[model samples]
Target: FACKTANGTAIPIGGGSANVYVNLAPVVNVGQNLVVDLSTQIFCHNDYPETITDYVTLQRGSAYGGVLSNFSGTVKYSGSSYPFPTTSETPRVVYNSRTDKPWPVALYLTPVSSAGGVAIKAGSLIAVLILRQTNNYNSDDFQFVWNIYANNDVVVPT
Candidate 1:
């Protein structure tokens, strides 16, 4: 599904998720007469759950290999007893001093695993947050949907 802009321009970005959820994304910017909409959602789980002791951080980098900006998240597994999804609008937030330089951005979300076992259910499409200028080919306008990132030490409860 495509989202329309204020000028009636259609954002042809691919959509994701068709389940009970929360929609969060507004028209942050527009391209050369083209529309750009960043859509994100959060879902809660009941039966399956995992808790983490270490803090998780969000960071971005350029294709050339430099750190961008960083962010954090808050999660709980006691009183709430629910799985919450925290998503950012733009996947990568890198800093390039020279506009002439080509800096491709990539965002990363790293979370610690739990003892009883941490698991990332397969087949979840996470939209890549992109921030770039409009080129003649629009090839600079990149987008990606990432799969779940699983911890090295994840165990299934017996």
Candidate 2:
């Protein structure tokens, strides 16, 4: 499968394999959470040919050419974790699931809150998806990464 934009540009996934790239909105307000539909973001020819299962991990940082802070945030998927707590490790497993067909996986993140006067900064968060395809003695595992940008401004209540 091939990953392309509206202009028929080719996105090179490793080994010419099936892959996807999500066009995120790139701006999330701190007062609200962000949600994404994984099914709609996938742009490829063949849907994963085998029964596939996947797990998701969340990371906070900048990408290769990104301008964000080191303050990463928590994530939840399809009610898997509901809300990721702040005190947990920066790198945490957010979602795990098994499916035999294409499923509409969701990604979620809440707004920044004050932690002892040190609030979570607005920045990019990387969601790493590890997918395993199984088919009768033929199994393959690969990973996909998605970047979500956030904007967290201090909002004071009256």
| Candidate topping lDDT | 2
The digit string of per-residue lDDT tens for model 2 on 36-78 reads 4554553333234344322323222122112112112333433
Error of 1 at 58 (Å): 14
Model 1, 1-158: lDDT tens per residue? 12222223333333221221112121111111111112222111111113211111122112110001111122221212111133333232232222221222222222222212222222222322222222222233333222222112222242
- Model-by-model lDDT, in order? 0.22, 0.33
Write down the worst ten-residue block by lDDT for model 2: 61-70
Q: With candidate 2 superimposed using the best TM-score fit, by how many Å does residue 106's alpha carbon deviate from the native?
A: 1.7
- Give me the overall lDDT of model 2: 0.33
| RMSD in Å for model 2 | 8.2
Residue pairs in clash, model 2: none
